[PDB]
């Protein structure tokens, strides 16, 4: 995925385009959380997302943060309702 490819699409479609490339990677890392974690990351600036697509360590760091945030959110909500 290139910046020129992205530049060719409207903003919501740019997010889909990035998501289609990120998803198989994020899914490999966390199959059960794949769509949610991808959605969380897609809120980030596109320039940073392009960077993450080319930098496995950057993607791993961000995914680790998203997983921690998602799991803490879900567990906190469960604890409050339990």
């Amino acid at each position: 995925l290139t910046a020129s490819m992205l530049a060719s699409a409207p903003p919501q479609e740019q997010k889909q385009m990035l998501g289609e490339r990120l998803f198989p990677l994020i899914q490999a890392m966390h199959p059960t959380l794949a769509g949610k974690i991808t959605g969380m990351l897609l809120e980030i600036d596109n320039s940073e997302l392009l960077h993450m697509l080319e930098s496995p360590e950057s993607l791993r760091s961000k995914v680790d943060e998203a997983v921690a945030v998602l799991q803490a959110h879900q567990a906190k909500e469960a604890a409050q309702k339990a």
Binding site: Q16, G19, G35, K36, M40, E43, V69, L70
Partner: peptide, 11 residues
């Protein structure tokens, strides 16, 4: 990061 973000659906 927003844990209430919309689920991404591959299409």
């Amino acid at each position: 990061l927003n844990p209430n973000a919309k689920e991404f659906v591959p299409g």
